[PDB]
Design a protein around this motif. Structure first.
Motif, PDB file in Angstrom:
ATOM      1  N   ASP A   5      83.269  45.242  19.587  1.00  0.00           N
ATOM      2  CA  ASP A   5      82.890  43.877  19.895  1.00  0.00           C
ATOM      3  C   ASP A   5      81.378  43.809  20.009  1.00  0.00           C
ATOM      4  N   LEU A   7      77.820  42.287  21.332  1.00  0.00           N
ATOM      5  CA  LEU A   7      77.339  41.847  22.625  1.00  0.00           C
ATOM      6  C   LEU A   7      76.301  40.766  22.407  1.00  0.00           C
ATOM      7  N   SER A  10      72.375  38.956  24.855  1.00  0.00           N
ATOM      8  CA  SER A  10      71.042  39.353  24.445  1.00  0.00           C
ATOM      9  C   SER A  10      71.126  39.982  23.068  1.00  0.00           C
ATOM     10  N   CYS A  12      68.926  42.399  19.863  1.00  0.00           N
ATOM     11  CA  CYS A  12      68.102  43.579  19.663  1.00  0.00           C
ATOM     12  C   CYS A  12      66.917  43.256  18.768  1.00  0.00           C
ATOM     13  N   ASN A  13      65.748  43.787  19.093  1.00  0.00           N
ATOM     14  CA  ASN A  13      64.583  43.527  18.275  1.00  0.00           C
ATOM     15  C   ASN A  13      64.428  44.744  17.396  1.00  0.00           C
ATOM     16  N   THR A  14      64.888  44.646  16.154  1.00  0.00           N
ATOM     17  CA  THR A  14      64.824  45.786  15.253  1.00  0.00           C
ATOM     18  C   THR A  14      63.434  46.263  14.856  1.00  0.00           C
TER      19      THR A  14
END
Lengths: 49, 49
Positions: A5, A7, A10, A12-14
């Motif tokens: 699943d 999330l 928030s 993620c800043n790749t």
């Protein structure tokens, strides 16, 4: 029997990109894009004073 | 003859119900409802950075 699943509270800043010019060190040089530089032989800048 | 033993007051403290998103340390993490983690032992969070 794996299950996933994603999330979302928030994200993620790749990757973050640095631009250089956006830096302040960009002052100390005159950057110009000379695409033919691969084809050059010798660049000469001559100064008379 | 008149004598009486008196109850001169009763005091109760109100237990303060505080939630967790008041605190300043909610800056420090991300809270998300994840039911079924009783079911699952293994965990991995993968973000492509």
């Amino acid at each position: 029997d794996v299950e996933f699943d994603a999330l979302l509270g928030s994200y993620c800043n790749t990757l973050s990109l640095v631009r250089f010019l956006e830096l302040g060190l960009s002052v100390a040089c005159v950057c110009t894009k000379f695409p033919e530089l691969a084809y050059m032989n010798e660049g000469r800048v001559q100064f008379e004073v």
